[PDB]
Amino acid sequence: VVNVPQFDADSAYLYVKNQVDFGPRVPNTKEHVACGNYLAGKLEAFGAKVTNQYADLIAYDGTLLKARNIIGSYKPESKKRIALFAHWDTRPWADNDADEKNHHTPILGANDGASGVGALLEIARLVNQQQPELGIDIIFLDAEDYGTPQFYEGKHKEEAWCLGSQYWSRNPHVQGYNARFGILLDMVGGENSVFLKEGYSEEFAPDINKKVWKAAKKAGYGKTFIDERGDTITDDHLFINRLARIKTIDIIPNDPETGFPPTWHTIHDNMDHIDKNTLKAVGQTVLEVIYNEK
Numbered sequence: 001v002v003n004v005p006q007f008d009a010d011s012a013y014l015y016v017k018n019q020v021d022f023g024p025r026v027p028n029t030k031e032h033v034a035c036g037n038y039l040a041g042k043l044e045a046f047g048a049k050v051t052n053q054y055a056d057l058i059a060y061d062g063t064l065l066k067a068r069n070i071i072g073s074y075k076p077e078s079k080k081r082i083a084l085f086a087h088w089d090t091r092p093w094a095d096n097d098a099d100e101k102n103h104h105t106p107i108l109g110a111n112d113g114a115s116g117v118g119a120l121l122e123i124a125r126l127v128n129q130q131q132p133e134l135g136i137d138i139i140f141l142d143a144e145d146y147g148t149p150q151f152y153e154g155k156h157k158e159e160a161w162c163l164g165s166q167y168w169s170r171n172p173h174v175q176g177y178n179a180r181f182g183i184l185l186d187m188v189g190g191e192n193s194v195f196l197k198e199g200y201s202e203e204f205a206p207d208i209n210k211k212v213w214k215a216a217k218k219a220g221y222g223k224t225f226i227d228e229r230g231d232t233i234t235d236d237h238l239f240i241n242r243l244a245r246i247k248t249i250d251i252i253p254n255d256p257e258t259g260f261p262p263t264w265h266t267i268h269d270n271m272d273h274i275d276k277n278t279l280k281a282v283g284q285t286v287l288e289v290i291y292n293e294k
């Protein structure tokens with residue numbers, strides 16, 4: 001019926017490594033600016049129509065973040081669309097590290113940041129080469145991970161997180177923007193990771209979770225996409241669902257012992273713990289979903 005393209009895991013892995021090779025993508029650093037230029041340029045080289053959303057976002061403590069959401073659009077005139085999201089900034093503090101002396105050191109964010117973006121770059125390459133029926137938007141969200149440090153004494157507000165998705169959700173890149181549904185990729189490269197149906201995703205978009213997990217099973221990734229409800233996670237999709245009202249699910253790992261991968265918000269979130277086979281399982285599932293939408 002439909003020939004779904006084959007996600008190239010080696011290609012995706014290299015897009016992950018290329019981001020990490022800039023160093024930490026902390027908002028307001030030259031490394032962040034350079035990586036943003038790399039990502040926008042790559043989308044444009046893969047035939048996307050690129051819209052940049054530069055915004056002055058205010059962090060939990062009053063810090064102004066020079067943020068840039070990057071949107072790459074395929075079949076831009078189609079009104080029938082699927083939105084694919086990943087955050088591209090990295091966290092400026094390894095505030096979950098086992099050693100306190102690292103709690104003020106920026107992470108490399110290989111899994112938390114680079115993995116989702118790298119997977120979506122590989123999807124963008126393939127969408128260009130053979131388009132699905134629906135228009136696809138690849139949306140790289142800034143300033144997701146500048147939320148209140150664990151060491152901070154004071155108010156820990158939910159809205160300190162996901163500043164780029166909040167901005168995008170209130171201020172779409174094109175007036176009247178609609179999508180049938182959305183998929184957010186968050187930490188999709190970790191060795192041995194499995195993905196359960198996330199709680200907010202189940203509450204806002206259970207039909208989309210069903211679609212995605214059925215697609216994974218059908219494509220042979222049923223051992224990676226486990227048909228079971230996991231944790232409820234504050235992530236970009238919460239704000240997208242609440243503010244933009246696009247039914248959006250989160251593909252995010254769940255481990256029974258650590259919840260998130262053990263590298264999460266530690267100085268160990270680097271390429272040593274990225275497995276291209278995890279990228280493959282997630283990326284191929286996303287392809288299976290978008291190419292079977294009519």
Ligand SMILES: c1ccc(Cn2ccnc2)cc1
Nearest residue numbers: 112145147161186233234235
């Ligand atoms: C608290 C805040 C945010 C999250 C989600 N998240 C995803 C990547 N880094 C953090 C989980 C708990």
Ligand SMILES: [Zn+2]
Nearest residue numbers: 091112145265
């Ligand atoms: Zn994070």
